[PDB]
Symmetry: C2
Subunit: 194 residues, 2 copies
């Protein structure tokens, strides 16, 4: 059960998340919970850890900038984090809020949430499951999501590679800064595209 990892039931968690997040965002989290379960089954990851990490991954999406800056100071995190924003923070810093609120201490689940946006050069299978689940969950509708879904049916690594390449491509297309850890992920996984 979820209570093996957090301080409340799944039902209790959903009630709490419904207060924290817009409807569309909670719907997304429920989508990631489901997609993570399917991917974990496929690729030999604990379905329960995948499901919970999937539900929780965007728990901190709506924290204010000030709250994130407070957490960076309190946990004495990488000071460079102050140069970024919500997209980097909600996973990389938001894990601390999740830990405070839910008493989540499982290192594997925390790490999967931590890097769900930016990845890392080295990712566990759980990390990859959450990273991909976020991109392919059934509520998502962006051009090319069909390709991501097909790839994810065959190869977890190629799915990470594809998603990361598309993210880097889109950020450069839009003229947004690219977090350096994102490139670390990109360069580590891009060989899987062939």
């Amino acid at each position: 059960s979820y209570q093996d990892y957090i301080n409340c039931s799944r039902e209790a968690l959903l009630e709490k998340m419904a207060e924290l997040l817009p409807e569309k965002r909670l719907t997304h989290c429920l989508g990631v919970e489901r997609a993570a379960m399917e991917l974990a089954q496929r690729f030999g990851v604990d379905v329960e850890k995948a499901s919970l990490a999937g539900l929780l991954h965007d728990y901190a999406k709506k924290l204010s900038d000030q709250e994130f800056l407070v957490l960076i100071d309190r946990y004495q995190l990488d000071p460079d984090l102050k140069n970024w924003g919500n997209n980097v923070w909600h996973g990389m810093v938001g894990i601390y809020k999740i830990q405070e609120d839910l008493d989540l201490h499982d290192s594997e689940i925390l790490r999967a949430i931590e890097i769900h946006t930016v990845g890392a050069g080295q990712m566990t299978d759980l990390d990859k499951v959450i990273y991909v689940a976020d991109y392919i969950e059934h509520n998502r509708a962006f051009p090319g999501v069909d390709v991501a879904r097909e790839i994810a049916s065959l190869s977890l690594n190629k799915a990470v590679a594809y998603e990361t390449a598309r993210t880097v491509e889109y950020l450069a297309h839009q003229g947004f800064p690219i977090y350096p850890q994102t490139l670390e992920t990109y360069n580590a996984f891009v060989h899987y595209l062939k």
Copy 2:
């Protein structure tokens, strides 16, 4: 004159480069020489240093992999360079071959050639001139070169930003590894797009 910086005349250099490079590549170098002169005039860079760096920038384009690996060892360069290829090497390592052949010691010209492919987070105006000249020289015909040319008529910094964004976008589109220094350039300049 060019002989103020190298061990031969411009005419002598062109004869030497004609033996080293395919016709199309030498034509390109002549295009960069010209574009660098125009940009340097516009943005307050020594036109002579810009012209020479422009002509020389791709001097080492046709060195073999083995020759580059030999130079990395001989000059005890960043060992990570062995994980890359011609695109990174011809500037970053090729400067040593240029120095050997032509007795080029001017630090400014060498640096501009060194980073003409990947840029850096900190670039001199000469560095930016060569970086942009390479992209907009009159022989180039790629979709969007007209936009690059317009931007370069107004802002050197925005031209660097635009070129770097398009390069990162294209590398990710194609599924090629992105040299980390390229991202350093991207993140440093992307603010100029606005």
